[PDB]
Structure formats: C-alpha cells, structure tokens
mmCIF file of C-alpha atoms in Angstrom:
data_model
loop_
_atom_site.group_PDB
_atom_site.id
_atom_site.type_symbol
_atom_site.label_atom_id
_atom_site.label_comp_id
_atom_site.label_asym_id
_atom_site.label_seq_id
_atom_site.Cartn_x
_atom_site.Cartn_y
_atom_site.Cartn_z
ATOM 1 C CA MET X 32 15.581 -28.562 13.531
ATOM 2 C CA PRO X 33 14.477 -25.664 11.310
ATOM 3 C CA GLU X 34 11.630 -26.537 8.931
ATOM 4 C CA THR X 35 14.009 -25.588 6.125
ATOM 5 C CA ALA X 36 17.686 -24.638 5.975
ATOM 6 C CA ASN X 37 17.133 -22.361 2.972
ATOM 7 C CA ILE X 38 16.188 -18.704 2.617
ATOM 8 C CA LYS X 39 17.186 -15.865 0.316
ATOM 9 C CA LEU X 40 17.842 -12.602 2.133
ATOM 10 C CA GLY X 41 18.563 -9.385 0.308
ATOM 11 C CA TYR X 42 21.121 -6.790 1.301
ATOM 12 C CA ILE X 43 22.393 -3.457 0.015
ATOM 13 C CA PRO X 44 26.228 -3.056 0.015
ATOM 14 C CA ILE X 45 26.517 -0.721 3.016
ATOM 15 C CA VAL X 46 27.604 -1.262 6.653
ATOM 16 C CA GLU X 47 24.019 -1.953 7.767
ATOM 17 C CA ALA X 48 24.307 -5.310 5.966
ATOM 18 C CA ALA X 49 27.151 -6.561 8.174
ATOM 19 C CA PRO X 50 25.151 -8.912 10.438
ATOM 20 C CA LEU X 51 23.731 -10.774 7.434
ATOM 21 C CA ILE X 52 27.113 -11.187 5.761
ATOM 22 C CA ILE X 53 28.925 -12.110 8.984
ATOM 23 C CA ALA X 54 26.208 -14.504 10.169
ATOM 24 C CA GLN X 55 26.714 -16.321 6.867
ATOM 25 C CA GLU X 56 30.501 -16.130 6.442
ATOM 26 C CA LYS X 57 31.464 -16.829 10.079
ATOM 27 C CA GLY X 58 29.084 -19.780 10.348
ATOM 28 C CA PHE X 59 26.592 -18.352 12.831
ATOM 29 C CA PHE X 60 23.628 -19.206 10.588
ATOM 30 C CA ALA X 61 25.006 -22.722 10.092
ATOM 31 C CA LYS X 62 25.472 -23.158 13.850
ATOM 32 C CA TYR X 63 21.694 -23.067 14.215
ATOM 33 C CA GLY X 64 20.916 -25.207 11.179
ATOM 34 C CA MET X 65 20.509 -22.545 8.507
ATOM 35 C CA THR X 66 23.147 -23.848 6.099
ATOM 36 C CA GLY X 67 21.367 -22.710 2.947
ATOM 37 C CA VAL X 68 21.156 -18.955 3.428
ATOM 38 C CA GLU X 69 21.709 -16.955 0.251
ATOM 39 C CA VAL X 70 22.752 -13.372 1.020
ATOM 40 C CA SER X 71 21.737 -11.729 -2.269
ATOM 41 C CA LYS X 72 22.915 -8.264 -3.288
ATOM 42 C CA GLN X 73 20.066 -5.978 -4.360
ATOM 43 C CA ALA X 74 20.668 -3.399 -7.104
ATOM 44 C CA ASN X 75 18.835 -0.673 -5.183
ATOM 45 C CA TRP X 76 15.933 -0.215 -2.771
ATOM 46 C CA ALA X 77 13.276 -0.287 -5.499
ATOM 47 C CA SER X 78 14.656 -3.644 -6.648
ATOM 48 C CA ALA X 79 14.736 -4.956 -3.072
ATOM 49 C CA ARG X 80 11.095 -3.910 -2.688
ATOM 50 C CA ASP X 81 10.153 -5.614 -5.952
ATOM 51 C CA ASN X 82 12.111 -8.758 -5.137
ATOM 52 C CA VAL X 83 10.468 -9.298 -1.747
ATOM 53 C CA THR X 84 7.030 -8.778 -3.311
ATOM 54 C CA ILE X 85 7.705 -11.602 -5.782
ATOM 55 C CA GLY X 86 9.311 -13.738 -3.095
ATOM 56 C CA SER X 87 12.022 -16.347 -3.589
ATOM 57 C CA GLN X 88 9.760 -18.713 -5.508
ATOM 58 C CA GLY X 89 9.285 -16.056 -8.187
ATOM 59 C CA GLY X 90 13.011 -15.396 -8.399
ATOM 60 C CA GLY X 91 13.114 -12.665 -5.757
ATOM 61 C CA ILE X 92 13.834 -12.727 -2.013
ATOM 62 C CA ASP X 93 12.071 -13.958 1.153
ATOM 63 C CA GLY X 94 13.152 -10.971 3.205
ATOM 64 C CA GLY X 95 16.321 -9.173 4.153
ATOM 65 C CA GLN X 96 17.749 -5.793 5.107
ATOM 66 C CA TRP X 97 15.362 -2.827 5.145
ATOM 67 C CA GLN X 98 15.076 0.836 5.864
ATOM 68 C CA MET X 99 12.018 1.656 7.982
ATOM 69 C CA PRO X 100 9.093 1.546 7.555
ATOM 70 C CA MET X 101 9.457 -0.452 4.318
ATOM 71 C CA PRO X 102 8.165 -3.682 5.898
ATOM 72 C CA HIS X 103 5.031 -1.853 7.048
ATOM 73 C CA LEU X 104 4.487 -0.088 3.709
ATOM 74 C CA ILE X 105 4.832 -3.352 1.777
ATOM 75 C CA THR X 106 2.474 -5.095 4.226
ATOM 76 C CA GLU X 107 -0.185 -2.481 3.459
ATOM 77 C CA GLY X 108 0.549 -2.376 -0.275
ATOM 78 C CA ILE X 109 1.309 1.321 0.034
ATOM 79 C CA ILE X 110 4.506 1.237 -2.036
ATOM 80 C CA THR X 111 3.647 -1.818 -4.142
ATOM 81 C CA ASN X 112 0.714 -0.362 -6.094
ATOM 82 C CA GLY X 113 -1.817 -2.167 -3.918
ATOM 83 C CA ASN X 114 -0.054 -5.531 -3.792
ATOM 84 C CA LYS X 115 -0.241 -6.309 -0.073
ATOM 85 C CA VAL X 116 2.581 -8.603 1.026
ATOM 86 C CA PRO X 117 2.602 -8.914 4.848
ATOM 87 C CA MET X 118 6.019 -8.793 6.498
ATOM 88 C CA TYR X 119 7.396 -9.148 10.022
ATOM 89 C CA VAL X 120 10.058 -6.929 11.578
ATOM 90 C CA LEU X 121 12.297 -9.308 13.539
ATOM 91 C CA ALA X 122 15.407 -7.430 14.619
ATOM 92 C CA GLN X 123 17.192 -4.135 14.297
ATOM 93 C CA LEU X 124 20.493 -4.802 12.534
ATOM 94 C CA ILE X 125 22.453 -1.732 13.495
ATOM 95 C CA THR X 126 22.424 1.812 14.842
ATOM 96 C CA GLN X 127 24.426 4.710 13.378
ATOM 97 C CA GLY X 128 26.824 4.499 10.429
ATOM 98 C CA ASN X 129 24.781 7.157 8.580
ATOM 99 C CA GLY X 130 25.365 10.859 8.009
ATOM 100 C CA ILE X 131 24.676 13.967 5.950
ATOM 101 C CA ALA X 132 27.259 15.022 3.351
ATOM 102 C CA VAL X 133 27.400 18.563 1.972
ATOM 103 C CA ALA X 134 29.116 20.015 -1.115
ATOM 104 C CA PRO X 135 32.259 22.187 -0.743
ATOM 105 C CA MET X 136 30.497 25.318 -2.017
ATOM 106 C CA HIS X 137 28.753 25.470 1.372
ATOM 107 C CA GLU X 138 31.834 25.446 3.594
ATOM 108 C CA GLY X 139 32.080 28.270 6.118
ATOM 109 C CA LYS X 140 28.331 28.936 5.946
ATOM 110 C CA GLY X 141 27.338 27.304 9.227
ATOM 111 C CA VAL X 142 25.776 24.310 7.481
ATOM 112 C CA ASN X 143 26.829 21.849 10.177
ATOM 113 C CA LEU X 144 24.824 19.862 12.756
ATOM 114 C CA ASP X 145 22.582 22.804 13.691
ATOM 115 C CA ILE X 146 21.860 24.761 10.496
ATOM 116 C CA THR X 147 19.650 27.391 12.163
ATOM 117 C CA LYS X 148 21.950 30.308 11.291
ATOM 118 C CA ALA X 149 22.263 29.076 7.695
ATOM 119 C CA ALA X 150 18.528 28.598 7.093
ATOM 120 C CA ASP X 151 18.006 31.828 5.145
ATOM 121 C CA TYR X 152 21.089 31.075 3.035
ATOM 122 C CA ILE X 153 19.624 27.699 2.085
ATOM 123 C CA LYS X 154 16.073 28.978 1.543
ATOM 124 C CA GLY X 155 17.188 31.727 -0.826
ATOM 125 C CA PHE X 156 19.691 29.664 -2.808
ATOM 126 C CA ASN X 157 17.773 29.978 -6.085
ATOM 127 C CA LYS X 158 17.912 33.774 -6.058
ATOM 128 C CA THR X 159 21.529 33.943 -4.901
ATOM 129 C CA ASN X 160 23.036 30.913 -6.629
ATOM 130 C CA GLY X 161 20.829 30.023 -9.594
ATOM 131 C CA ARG X 162 19.066 26.895 -8.349
ATOM 132 C CA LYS X 163 17.068 25.698 -5.380
ATOM 133 C CA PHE X 164 19.295 23.958 -2.819
ATOM 134 C CA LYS X 165 19.369 20.352 -4.088
ATOM 135 C CA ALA X 166 19.560 17.394 -1.709
ATOM 136 C CA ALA X 167 19.167 13.675 -2.228
ATOM 137 C CA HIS X 168 18.553 10.308 -0.608
ATOM 138 C CA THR X 169 18.178 7.010 -2.479
ATOM 139 C CA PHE X 170 14.574 6.095 -1.636
ATOM 140 C CA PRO X 171 11.612 8.177 -0.467
ATOM 141 C CA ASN X 172 9.714 7.888 2.811
ATOM 142 C CA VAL X 173 12.271 5.835 4.743
ATOM 143 C CA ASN X 174 15.311 6.201 7.049
ATOM 144 C CA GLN X 175 17.673 8.386 5.063
ATOM 145 C CA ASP X 176 14.850 10.604 3.766
ATOM 146 C CA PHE X 177 13.802 11.032 7.436
ATOM 147 C CA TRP X 178 17.310 11.800 8.722
ATOM 148 C CA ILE X 179 17.948 14.631 6.290
ATOM 149 C CA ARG X 180 14.388 15.950 6.669
ATOM 150 C CA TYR X 181 14.780 16.074 10.467
ATOM 151 C CA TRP X 182 18.150 17.822 10.107
ATOM 152 C CA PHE X 183 16.795 20.411 7.649
ATOM 153 C CA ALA X 184 13.620 21.058 9.645
ATOM 154 C CA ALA X 185 15.350 21.292 13.029
ATOM 155 C CA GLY X 186 17.185 24.303 11.626
ATOM 156 C CA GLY X 187 14.167 25.981 10.065
ATOM 157 C CA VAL X 188 14.354 24.655 6.499
ATOM 158 C CA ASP X 189 11.212 23.041 5.068
ATOM 159 C CA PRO X 190 12.450 19.997 3.096
ATOM 160 C CA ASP X 191 9.394 20.030 0.826
ATOM 161 C CA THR X 192 8.915 23.718 0.066
ATOM 162 C CA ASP X 193 12.320 25.369 0.521
ATOM 163 C CA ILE X 194 14.537 22.924 -1.364
ATOM 164 C CA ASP X 195 14.572 20.202 -4.011
ATOM 165 C CA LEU X 196 14.746 16.909 -2.081
ATOM 166 C CA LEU X 197 15.036 14.098 -4.623
ATOM 167 C CA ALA X 198 15.465 10.336 -4.849
ATOM 168 C CA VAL X 199 18.705 9.794 -6.790
ATOM 169 C CA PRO X 200 21.072 6.809 -7.106
ATOM 170 C CA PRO X 201 24.143 7.135 -4.833
ATOM 171 C CA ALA X 202 26.846 7.105 -7.530
ATOM 172 C CA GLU X 203 24.891 9.671 -9.558
ATOM 173 C CA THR X 204 24.462 11.803 -6.436
ATOM 174 C CA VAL X 205 28.182 11.785 -5.650
ATOM 175 C CA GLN X 206 28.998 12.603 -9.277
ATOM 176 C CA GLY X 207 26.557 15.490 -8.968
ATOM 177 C CA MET X 208 28.379 16.702 -5.871
ATOM 178 C CA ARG X 209 31.651 16.519 -7.802
ATOM 179 C CA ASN X 210 30.116 18.415 -10.740
ATOM 180 C CA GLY X 211 28.750 21.111 -8.438
ATOM 181 C CA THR X 212 25.089 20.351 -9.170
ATOM 182 C CA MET X 213 24.173 18.527 -5.925
ATOM 183 C CA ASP X 214 24.261 20.279 -2.540
ATOM 184 C CA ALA X 215 23.565 17.647 0.130
ATOM 185 C CA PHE X 216 23.369 13.860 0.346
ATOM 186 C CA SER X 217 21.778 11.742 3.092
ATOM 187 C CA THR X 218 24.050 8.716 3.038
ATOM 188 C CA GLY X 219 26.070 6.277 5.135
ATOM 189 C CA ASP X 220 29.254 4.232 5.376
ATOM 190 C CA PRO X 221 31.269 3.645 3.290
ATOM 191 C CA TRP X 222 30.258 6.806 1.398
ATOM 192 C CA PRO X 223 31.352 9.483 3.916
ATOM 193 C CA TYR X 224 34.972 8.291 3.925
ATOM 194 C CA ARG X 225 35.191 8.553 0.133
ATOM 195 C CA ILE X 226 33.364 11.869 -0.093
ATOM 196 C CA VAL X 227 35.752 13.501 2.384
ATOM 197 C CA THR X 228 39.052 11.866 1.406
ATOM 198 C CA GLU X 229 38.430 12.562 -2.286
ATOM 199 C CA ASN X 230 37.524 16.175 -1.477
ATOM 200 C CA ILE X 231 34.026 15.791 -2.919
ATOM 201 C CA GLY X 232 32.423 17.278 0.192
ATOM 202 C CA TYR X 233 32.309 17.342 3.995
ATOM 203 C CA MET X 234 30.071 15.841 6.685
ATOM 204 C CA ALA X 235 27.563 18.247 8.224
ATOM 205 C CA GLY X 236 26.758 15.664 10.865
ATOM 206 C CA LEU X 237 26.375 11.999 11.706
ATOM 207 C CA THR X 238 23.041 10.451 12.570
ATOM 208 C CA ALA X 239 24.921 9.412 15.745
ATOM 209 C CA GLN X 240 24.811 13.137 16.562
ATOM 210 C CA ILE X 241 21.259 13.827 15.336
ATOM 211 C CA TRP X 242 19.746 11.032 17.440
ATOM 212 C CA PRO X 243 22.311 9.054 19.464
ATOM 213 C CA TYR X 244 21.794 5.303 19.176
ATOM 214 C CA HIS X 245 18.786 5.843 16.907
ATOM 215 C CA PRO X 246 16.878 2.912 15.379
ATOM 216 C CA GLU X 247 18.174 2.252 11.857
ATOM 217 C CA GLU X 248 18.220 -0.803 9.549
ATOM 218 C CA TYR X 249 16.154 -3.908 10.226
ATOM 219 C CA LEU X 250 15.772 -7.550 9.346
ATOM 220 C CA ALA X 251 12.259 -8.304 8.064
ATOM 221 C CA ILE X 252 10.913 -11.421 6.387
ATOM 222 C CA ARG X 253 7.630 -12.160 4.597
ATOM 223 C CA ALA X 254 4.905 -13.210 7.023
ATOM 224 C CA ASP X 255 3.919 -16.217 4.933
ATOM 225 C CA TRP X 256 7.493 -17.533 5.143
ATOM 226 C CA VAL X 257 7.768 -16.913 8.904
ATOM 227 C CA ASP X 258 4.339 -18.387 9.676
ATOM 228 C CA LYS X 259 5.302 -21.515 7.732
ATOM 229 C CA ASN X 260 8.826 -21.716 9.182
ATOM 230 C CA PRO X 261 8.740 -20.476 12.819
ATOM 231 C CA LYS X 262 11.709 -22.574 13.977
ATOM 232 C CA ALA X 263 13.854 -21.511 11.014
ATOM 233 C CA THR X 264 12.942 -17.894 11.733
ATOM 234 C CA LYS X 265 14.191 -18.150 15.325
ATOM 235 C CA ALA X 266 17.331 -19.933 14.097
ATOM 236 C CA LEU X 267 18.094 -17.032 11.757
ATOM 237 C CA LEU X 268 17.542 -14.594 14.633
ATOM 238 C CA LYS X 269 20.031 -16.441 16.848
ATOM 239 C CA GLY X 270 22.606 -16.433 14.056
ATOM 240 C CA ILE X 271 22.113 -12.694 13.603
ATOM 241 C CA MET X 272 22.372 -12.049 17.365
ATOM 242 C CA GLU X 273 25.654 -13.928 17.621
ATOM 243 C CA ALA X 274 27.004 -12.132 14.558
ATOM 244 C CA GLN X 275 26.069 -8.772 16.103
ATOM 245 C CA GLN X 276 27.780 -9.671 19.380
ATOM 246 C CA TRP X 277 30.858 -10.794 17.428
ATOM 247 C CA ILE X 278 30.981 -7.652 15.283
ATOM 248 C CA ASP X 279 30.898 -5.364 18.325
ATOM 249 C CA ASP X 280 34.045 -6.856 19.867
ATOM 250 C CA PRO X 281 36.811 -4.508 18.609
ATOM 251 C CA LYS X 282 39.188 -7.454 18.240
ATOM 252 C CA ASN X 283 37.012 -8.884 15.454
ATOM 253 C CA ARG X 284 36.442 -5.726 13.458
ATOM 254 C CA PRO X 285 39.489 -6.007 11.208
ATOM 255 C CA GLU X 286 38.134 -9.359 10.006
ATOM 256 C CA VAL X 287 34.601 -7.944 9.727
ATOM 257 C CA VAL X 288 35.922 -5.211 7.429
ATOM 258 C CA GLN X 289 37.964 -7.668 5.360
ATOM 259 C CA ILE X 290 34.955 -9.938 4.821
ATOM 260 C CA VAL X 291 32.318 -7.372 3.868
ATOM 261 C CA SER X 292 34.738 -5.507 1.582
ATOM 262 C CA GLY X 293 35.445 -8.647 -0.447
ATOM 263 C CA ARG X 294 34.823 -9.011 -4.184
ATOM 264 C CA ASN X 295 31.792 -11.223 -3.572
ATOM 265 C CA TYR X 296 30.191 -8.654 -1.274
ATOM 266 C CA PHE X 297 30.818 -4.875 -1.235
ATOM 267 C CA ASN X 298 33.853 -5.258 -3.534
ATOM 268 C CA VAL X 299 35.654 -2.164 -2.207
ATOM 269 C CA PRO X 300 39.095 -1.362 -0.714
ATOM 270 C CA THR X 301 39.165 -2.133 3.020
ATOM 271 C CA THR X 302 40.755 1.254 3.630
ATOM 272 C CA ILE X 303 37.433 3.033 3.076
ATOM 273 C CA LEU X 304 35.811 1.021 5.890
ATOM 274 C CA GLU X 305 38.590 0.692 8.467
ATOM 275 C CA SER X 306 38.139 4.191 9.920
ATOM 276 C CA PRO X 307 34.360 4.160 10.519
ATOM 277 C CA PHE X 308 34.568 0.769 12.207
ATOM 278 C CA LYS X 309 36.683 2.497 14.852
ATOM 279 C CA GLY X 310 34.243 5.385 15.129
ATOM 280 C CA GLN X 311 36.722 7.651 13.358
ATOM 281 C CA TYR X 312 35.343 10.268 10.983
ATOM 282 C CA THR X 313 36.959 13.301 9.412
ATOM 283 C CA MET X 314 34.094 15.805 9.390
ATOM 284 C CA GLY X 315 35.639 18.755 7.577
ATOM 285 C CA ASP X 316 34.431 22.349 7.274
ATOM 286 C CA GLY X 317 36.839 23.255 10.059
ATOM 287 C CA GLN X 318 35.056 21.029 12.566
ATOM 288 C CA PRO X 319 36.913 18.581 14.830
ATOM 289 C CA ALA X 320 37.275 14.985 13.700
ATOM 290 C CA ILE X 321 35.368 12.307 15.578
ATOM 291 C CA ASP X 322 37.284 9.495 17.285
ATOM 292 C CA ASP X 323 34.798 7.616 19.447
ATOM 293 C CA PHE X 324 33.831 3.946 19.137
ATOM 294 C CA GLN X 325 30.402 4.885 20.538
ATOM 295 C CA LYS X 326 29.733 7.157 17.565
ATOM 296 C CA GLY X 327 30.432 4.535 14.923
ATOM 297 C CA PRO X 328 28.134 1.698 13.832
ATOM 298 C CA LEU X 329 26.989 -0.516 16.716
ATOM 299 C CA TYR X 330 25.252 -3.841 16.226
ATOM 300 C CA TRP X 331 24.541 -5.416 19.634
ATOM 301 C CA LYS X 332 24.559 -2.957 22.533
ATOM 302 C CA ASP X 333 24.561 0.824 22.602
ATOM 303 C CA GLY X 334 24.642 3.497 25.298
ATOM 304 C CA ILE X 335 20.910 3.211 26.029
ATOM 305 C CA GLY X 336 19.815 -0.375 25.525
ATOM 306 C CA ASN X 337 20.088 -3.374 23.238
ATOM 307 C CA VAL X 338 20.519 -2.534 19.560
ATOM 308 C CA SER X 339 19.121 -5.751 18.103
ATOM 309 C CA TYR X 340 15.843 -5.863 20.057
ATOM 310 C CA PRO X 341 13.181 -4.156 17.906
ATOM 311 C CA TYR X 342 11.430 -1.718 20.252
ATOM 312 C CA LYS X 343 7.854 -1.066 19.168
ATOM 313 C CA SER X 344 8.367 2.516 20.302
ATOM 314 C CA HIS X 345 10.817 2.883 17.400
ATOM 315 C CA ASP X 346 8.336 1.504 14.814
ATOM 316 C CA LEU X 347 5.984 4.104 16.273
ATOM 317 C CA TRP X 348 8.481 6.896 15.701
ATOM 318 C CA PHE X 349 8.906 5.923 12.027
ATOM 319 C CA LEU X 350 5.148 5.945 11.416
ATOM 320 C CA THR X 351 4.723 9.117 13.485
ATOM 321 C CA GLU X 352 7.408 10.819 11.372
ATOM 322 C CA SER X 353 5.641 9.511 8.238
ATOM 323 C CA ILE X 354 2.503 11.272 9.470
ATOM 324 C CA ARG X 355 4.617 14.354 10.236
ATOM 325 C CA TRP X 356 5.458 14.718 6.538
ATOM 326 C CA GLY X 357 2.018 13.813 5.220
ATOM 327 C CA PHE X 358 3.245 10.558 3.707
ATOM 328 C CA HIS X 359 0.559 8.024 2.765
ATOM 329 C CA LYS X 360 -2.279 10.371 3.773
ATOM 330 C CA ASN X 361 -5.076 7.913 2.999
ATOM 331 C CA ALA X 362 -3.395 4.704 4.163
ATOM 332 C CA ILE X 363 -2.096 6.043 7.487
ATOM 333 C CA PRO X 364 -4.522 8.874 8.430
ATOM 334 C CA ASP X 365 -3.992 8.673 12.196
ATOM 335 C CA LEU X 366 -1.826 7.341 15.015
ATOM 336 C CA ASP X 367 -4.357 4.660 15.919
ATOM 337 C CA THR X 368 -4.009 3.165 12.433
ATOM 338 C CA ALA X 369 -0.231 3.406 12.756
ATOM 339 C CA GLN X 370 -0.305 1.417 16.003
ATOM 340 C CA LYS X 371 -2.553 -1.217 14.422
ATOM 341 C CA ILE X 372 -0.064 -1.679 11.572
ATOM 342 C CA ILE X 373 2.813 -1.894 14.051
ATOM 343 C CA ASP X 374 1.044 -4.535 16.117
ATOM 344 C CA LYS X 375 0.711 -6.726 13.014
ATOM 345 C CA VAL X 376 4.245 -6.102 11.689
ATOM 346 C CA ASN X 377 6.587 -5.887 14.694
ATOM 347 C CA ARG X 378 7.432 -9.331 16.081
ATOM 348 C CA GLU X 379 9.586 -8.374 19.056
ATOM 349 C CA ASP X 380 8.078 -11.415 20.764
ATOM 350 C CA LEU X 381 10.048 -13.662 18.400
ATOM 351 C CA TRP X 382 13.250 -11.776 19.226
ATOM 352 C CA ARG X 383 12.572 -12.359 22.945
ATOM 353 C CA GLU X 384 11.810 -16.021 22.339
ATOM 354 C CA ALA X 385 14.940 -16.603 20.233
ATOM 355 C CA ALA X 386 17.138 -14.748 22.739
ATOM 356 C CA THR X 387 15.726 -16.848 25.581
ATOM 357 C CA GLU X 388 16.304 -20.127 23.739
ATOM 358 C CA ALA X 389 19.866 -19.087 22.859
ATOM 359 C CA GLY X 390 20.740 -18.170 26.437
ATOM 360 C CA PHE X 391 20.841 -14.386 26.046
ATOM 361 C CA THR X 392 18.167 -13.666 28.669
ATOM 362 C CA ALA X 393 20.447 -11.153 30.403
ATOM 363 C CA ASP X 394 20.289 -8.989 27.263
ATOM 364 C CA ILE X 395 16.507 -8.880 26.866
ATOM 365 C CA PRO X 396 15.012 -5.396 27.435
ATOM 366 C CA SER X 397 12.318 -5.170 30.118
ATOM 367 C CA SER X 398 9.846 -3.296 27.900
ATOM 368 C CA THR X 399 8.648 -2.912 24.299
ATOM 369 C CA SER X 400 9.470 0.775 24.726
ATOM 370 C CA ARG X 401 12.914 2.314 25.126
ATOM 371 C CA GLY X 402 11.245 5.269 26.815
ATOM 372 C CA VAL X 403 11.482 8.948 25.970
ATOM 373 C CA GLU X 404 13.825 9.595 23.029
ATOM 374 C CA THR X 405 15.890 12.771 22.787
ATOM 375 C CA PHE X 406 17.060 14.465 19.594
ATOM 376 C CA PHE X 407 20.054 16.794 19.241
ATOM 377 C CA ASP X 408 17.786 19.842 19.173
ATOM 378 C CA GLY X 409 16.063 19.203 22.493
ATOM 379 C CA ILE X 410 12.869 17.768 21.035
ATOM 380 C CA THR X 411 11.692 14.630 22.819
ATOM 381 C CA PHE X 412 9.540 11.770 21.574
ATOM 382 C CA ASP X 413 7.527 10.134 24.343
ATOM 383 C CA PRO X 414 6.127 6.885 22.882
ATOM 384 C CA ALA X 415 3.210 7.277 25.296
ATOM 385 C CA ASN X 416 2.177 10.523 23.576
ATOM 386 C CA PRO X 417 3.211 10.824 19.902
ATOM 387 C CA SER X 418 0.635 13.602 19.485
ATOM 388 C CA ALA X 419 2.636 15.810 21.849
ATOM 389 C CA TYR X 420 5.799 15.056 19.850
ATOM 390 C CA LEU X 421 4.176 16.117 16.578
ATOM 391 C CA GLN X 422 2.771 19.283 18.122
ATOM 392 C CA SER X 423 6.205 20.240 19.495
ATOM 393 C CA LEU X 424 7.697 20.262 15.973
ATOM 394 C CA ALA X 425 7.934 23.571 14.113
ATOM 395 C CA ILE X 426 7.837 22.265 10.531
ATOM 396 C CA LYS X 427 5.362 19.547 9.548
ATOM 397 C CA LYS X 428 2.408 18.793 7.262
ATOM 398 C CA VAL X 429 -0.150 17.923 9.938
#
C-alpha cells in the first residue's frame, strides 16, 4: 500500500511524455495503487522548473518529465537562483524521438548529419547572408541544447562563437523558420513531421543517428517527496515500466497515438504522430527517408540495453558535456564534483528494487554503466575515463 495515492507530475506535450500519459490513461498507475496521479501540462521548461521548486503544496508539481541534467541543477540550486531543491532521477522515459531541423535556404549545402564540408558556409553566414547563422532550442544547458551543440561541433562549428544559439519558444522558432529568420531548430516529435510536411524546413539528422539509443528524457521527483513516500515511489516506477513495455509493442501504438494526441493532452491531429511511432521520417534535402522502428522513439528496450533503467554512466555524460561547454563553472568545476552530485541524485537502486518486486528481474542491467558509448563521428565516451573523452573533442571550453 503506497503511503499516498496522490502526486502531481508535470509533462511537456511531446512524445517523451508518453509513459506518464499512458501509465495514467491505461490504468498502470492505478494497478499499483496510485489512483490519484495528476499528469499536469507545463507551459514550458522554465515553468516546469518553477513548479517543481514550489512543489505541489505551493500549487506546483512534485516531479515529472525532465531534460537532463535539470534534476541535478535544481538539486544544487544552479538554475533556481540558489534555491536548492533536491531531486531524484528514477527512470529514463524514452530514447530518440528528437532531431535537428534546418531552414530551406540551406538545402543543397551539405548541412546534413555530418556538416564538416558546410562548416565554413555556416561560420561566414553573417558576411555572406547578412546575419550570423541562427539556431534555437527551448531551454539552455539541457538535452536539446546538447544535441545541437554536439552536431555543430562535430562538424567544426563552435556553437558559442560561430553562431547565435538562442533559447526560443518552439512556436516562435517555427514561425521564424517560416519567415526566413531562423536557420536551425533542435526539436523533437511531433515537430519534425509538421516542419517537413508543411515545407517549413528539412531534417538534418535525428538524434537516433547522432547517438543511437542515447539517454534522453527522465522521470525525477523531489527528494523530500520520495523520502517520505518510498512505497508510492516504487509503485509509480512499476506503472511507468509497464506503460513503457506496453508502448513498445507495435500493436498498441495506434492507441498510444490516439490517447496522447487527445484534446486533454497534446491536442493535435493524430496524423502528425502516426509516422514517427513507426520510425518513419521524411528527412528531405534529397536524403533518403527513414523507415526503421529502431530509429523511432523507444521506451522499454533498445538495441544496446534497457531504456528505462537510468545508467549512472549517462548522468555522467550529461555533466561531462556540461563541463565541456563551461556551463556552471563555479558549481561544477570538476568531474569529481559531478560524480558526487550524481551519487546523490541518481536512484537507479530504486529502479532495480521496483523491477525486482514487479517481476521484471530478467530486464535488469548487470551494471550501473552501459559501457563505452559511441557517437556518429567516431568519438567514444568511456564512463571510466571522462577526461579522455573531453580531451578527444576538438571544440570545447575546457
């Protein structure tokens, strides 16, 4: 019996939110006693951040969906103006379902997955086209900022000095692309489908290509709530695990799409989500379309290991990449400090415990590390030596 059947979890209306919505709507949360879960739509990431800092009692949220390393940054008060609100990372919600969109003006320039040959074109855009190449994500220092930064830098473009990388709302960004004032957009489903079908732009590449089966969105809840309600926390985890398993069975995806697209959730036409849930993406710019289930969003198991289990080696990559770009210079000055933060935030042990109790022992990874990670450009990240990873990178601020 959970200590409480209630909790307010925030979500952003994108495919990464699926496990939360499905766990609620298909009764997986209820199956384990969590009959009072409120899946609350957040206006944007800044609002989500603010709402978890105030907690449910103050009218906000107890936890929810997050881009990494938001839970860690909030725990240390780094992005909350010093207001430290400890949080626990409990499960990875999904992998893939993200990608980089580029404006039509850049077609035929080689601005695809590997932009190496187009680097000079991008770097000299102000002289040749009247403005610095402009790219956007919707929140700094997290997932989507990292994806586009890695993509730019892998090809020789410094995302801080060579272009204008800004935090801009998604709708405003797409309008900018339509108006010809925005050049690239680090986004995710359902945006790519609309951008391409409405001829607003093309997809340079999917994160599924940049880093196959990469860590992405996570479930994280305030530490004070989890410490007070350990049983309820494990119940929520089991509900999420079952929802993830359910979502990954192709037979259930039409219903998954119908549910999340509903008026009370995403409130969008199912047509813009049907394709990606089959791993089908029209890429454009003369490149072949993608038609591979393994390249679409995955919620339970991927080609390497278990999606849901939160590998500490992935938390390490996010903080290592934060260090790469000189983010939070005073708060996270070294890798030792990063590991200390990870050891207080990542609660993979609770995922293991919940999985064991639920009878999913066969799906539990044998280590807290998924081993050496390989990016599309040949660079490898060995969790045992993040220093070597950083030193192997051409563009960085350390």
